[PDB]
């Protein structure tokens, strides 16, 4: 006889029972409990009686409001009483009281006359009392070893809570850039364009650089704003292919490679802004960037392929919105962000940033992964041009093609989502 039998309520006293059983196993005792076994079934009964009658040396009972008047506990107590009569051991059953709502006068008749161990005010002194009682009654034990409790905790209570080798695919918020125009052009408009023209209002994206103009546009484009451009010698245009400066294999006194990349990024950003103006999507000037969102009633019942982009929350309508920035690292991409903006009647933004912050904090509370990703891909797919792409118009005959499906990532480790 080496086992110490723990009786308890299965779904209610699990925390204390696990704690005490693992502590006792760590001290070096041998313990029998029904929470230390997997693959159960016909094990119940015809095995409990056998271990109580032939293996148990001490019968620890956990007394609480749940274990009082429970059928399995009462039957096990009856068997334990028969075993106690069978042997010459009056101290065979030890109650342990833990429930503050179980008064000492409301105990079942089987253990009203027994001297119990108190646990209500603290568990450390209860554990010390149990250890002292076991030492005084010479309960069998081996050398102390906490590795047994460690292993049992790992194998029983950490069983279905690990990672699994499973191939999965993830969507991201990056859109790869597919096309680039074949040349970057510098037009030498030497003191022919006005000194304060504010070239940011032109028809095509242009950037001032020295006495030149860096753009993807055609030599005599934007003739409306600059009338004196037809008489221009095209041989003085500096042409640099885009692939060479993208790969980093170009550098000269006129312009460095990093400067070329920066100007290309500026052109891409301005083209995205102008195209979003073309798309007729409402603007929102944030602290440093600009976001884009849809009105109420623009879509067919505020849906794009069974995905809501405009919705309600009490007195305020919420609107999913995106912001996009073009980058050349790690690879040429357009990166997208997600925001929620709130309006009083679906057409005018509320002019209170604190109210916007509070509403956006209390609206994304219930939005999980699937909501975010479905809304993001729906809004991105809404902007798609013909079938699988979207063009930023850099000139009369120049376009930059961007994908409408985000970059996928692959993994080999996942979890089993056990509800």
């Amino acid at each position: 006889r080496n086992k110490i039998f723990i009786s308890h309520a299965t779904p209610d006293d699990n925390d204390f029972t696990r704690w005490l059983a693992l502590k006792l196993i760590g001290l070096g005792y041998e313990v029998w409990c029904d929470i230390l076994f997997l693959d159960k079934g016909v094990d119940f009964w015809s095995n409990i009686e056998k271990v109580i009658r032939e293996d148990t040396c001490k019968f620890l009972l956990v007394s609480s409001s749940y274990s009082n008047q429970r059928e399995g506990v009462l039957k096990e107590l009856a068997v334990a009483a028969k075993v106690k009569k069978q042997l010459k051991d009056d101290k065979f059953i030890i109650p342990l009281a833990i429930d503050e709502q179980l008064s000492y006068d409301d105990i079942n008749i089987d253990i009203v006359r027994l001297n119990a161990i108190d646990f209500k005010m603290s568990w450390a002194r209860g554990l010390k009392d149990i250890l002292e009682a076991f030492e005084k009654q010479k309960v069998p034990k081996e050398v102390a070893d906490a590795s047994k409790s460690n292993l049992l905790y790992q194998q029983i209570f950490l069983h279905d809570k690990s990672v699994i080798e499973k191939e999965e695919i993830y969507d991201s918020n990056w859109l790869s850039i597919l096309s680039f125009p074949e040349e970057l052009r510098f037009h030498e408009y030497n003191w022919m364009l006005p000194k304060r023209f504010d070239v940011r209002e032109l028809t095509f994206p242009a950037v001032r650089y020295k006495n030149y103009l860096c753009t993807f546009a055609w030599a005599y484009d934007f003739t409306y704003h600059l009338p004196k451009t037809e008489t221009y010698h095209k041989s003085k245009t500096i042409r640099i292919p885009t692939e060479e400066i993208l790969s980093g294999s170009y550098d000269s006194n006129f312009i460095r490679n990093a400067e070329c990349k920066r100007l290309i990024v500026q052109l891409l950003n301005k083209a995205f802004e102008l195209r979003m103006k073309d798309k007729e999507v409402q603007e929102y000037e944030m602290s440093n960037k600009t976001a884009y969102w849809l009105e109420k009633g623009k879509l067919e019942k505020d849906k794009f392929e069974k995905t809501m982009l405009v919705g309600k929350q009490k007195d305020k309508n919420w609107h999913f919105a995106i912001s996009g920035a073009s980058k050349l690292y790690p690879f040429p991409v357009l990166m997208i962000s997600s925001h929620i903006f709130f309006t009083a009647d679906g057409k005018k933004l509320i002019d209170s940033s604190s109210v916007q912050h509070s509403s956006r904090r209390r609206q994304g509370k219930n939005w999980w992964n699937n909501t975010w990703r479905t809304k993001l891909l729906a809004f991105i797919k809404y902007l798609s041009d013909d079938d699988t792409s979207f063009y930023l118009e850099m000139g009369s005959e120049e376009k930059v093609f961007v994908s409408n499906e985000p970059v996928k990532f692959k993994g080999n480790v996942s979890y089993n989502i056990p509800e």
Binding site: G26, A146, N150, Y170, S172, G364, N416
Partner: protein, 469 residues
Amino acid sequence: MKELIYIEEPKILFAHGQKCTDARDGLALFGPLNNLYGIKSGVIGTKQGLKIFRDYLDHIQKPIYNSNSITRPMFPGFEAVFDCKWESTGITFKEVTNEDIGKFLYNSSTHKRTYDLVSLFIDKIISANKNEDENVDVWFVIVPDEIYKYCRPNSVLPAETYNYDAQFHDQFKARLLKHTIPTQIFRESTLAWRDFKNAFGLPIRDFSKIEGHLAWTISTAAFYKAGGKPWKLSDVRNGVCYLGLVYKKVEKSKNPRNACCAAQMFLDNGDGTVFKGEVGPWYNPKNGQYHLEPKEAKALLSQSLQSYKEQIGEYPKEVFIHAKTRFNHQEWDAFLEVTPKETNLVGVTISKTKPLKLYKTEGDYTILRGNAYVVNERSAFLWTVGYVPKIQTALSMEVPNPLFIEINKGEADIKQVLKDILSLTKLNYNACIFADGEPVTLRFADKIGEILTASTDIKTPPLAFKYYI
């Protein structure tokens, strides 16, 4: 298609040489490393604050439960966990009259009233320390909510003292530094939250489902601040030193005069864990620049190397400088002019401002935690926040952001750098959580820098973390 890699959990160590991935589970199963005998606490505050503290101490001698035992392990009592006595009988009271508190919090100037309140509290604390017989391990400062409302730097009221920060907490912690008194600051609405309500009859802060989590956090902080070792890292390799550098803006004068502070971690060689601040705040006068001049860089690296040598007996075989910024050529040339010949110096930048989010295509649960995407031999993304299958939940609420780790200078292996960065997220002694989202070398250095920036009189400050956190 892009390929992701997985990094396994680092595991932490507890009593009896037992390893676990969680601190709550390992503390409930095994216990801490060292053997304290009992916490004798000094309580300075009003009468009702003293009663509140006594009630809370009486509350955490028993088991305290959460709503869900899987997502949040429960608290089996302070003596069951830490094997030491922290009870409301070994308490010394230093009364603070409410009339003085009311008097000093009206001067219509944040700086002056903050200075007056900090002086009021630290005068009693210092006098009790200097001229009394009772021994106190930690000093618990209970603060009313009216003091906490109006003492923030951006708080509106509905010269001599201007050379201090307008924050009560930082000024309080800095002005007690030269006495070396461990202290813990509690609001009155934190220990007794059920009594403080808004104009609807409900608590302003609801801890009903997370009482056990609060008990875990408070007990761990009190145990650590009294000289207890709760746990340590289990797979720290020998000859490697981790150094975190953080910059702050001194301001409160004509010169912004940026300042830099360091935190150091390495192996004791007795199988312990040395983790302490390395700070004599180093200054840069030019505004907006977060780089050290050659003299300051030489001094900082020399001090860190000498500290490691004195503790161990030999120079390190590997020094990783984690930082939130990049290094320039002057900085690294100054660094390399004092490093020993047979030592490898690697400078790593950990950035958070890099937009990238991965979405699972089917479920409403986010990406697994230890995933990483390697862009290049010198750069990689790392998810330190994400779903943890052990607790059946994630460490965030929305889709989490990854850290962008870049080997800025030196020659290292990015996979090992990611492994070390993930391991360092398991040492937040200021909390009782499953794991942090940032390495603790860059967080405790930030705390130290924000503490010794609220005053100008601090000289040769202490390095133990219990005097700042």
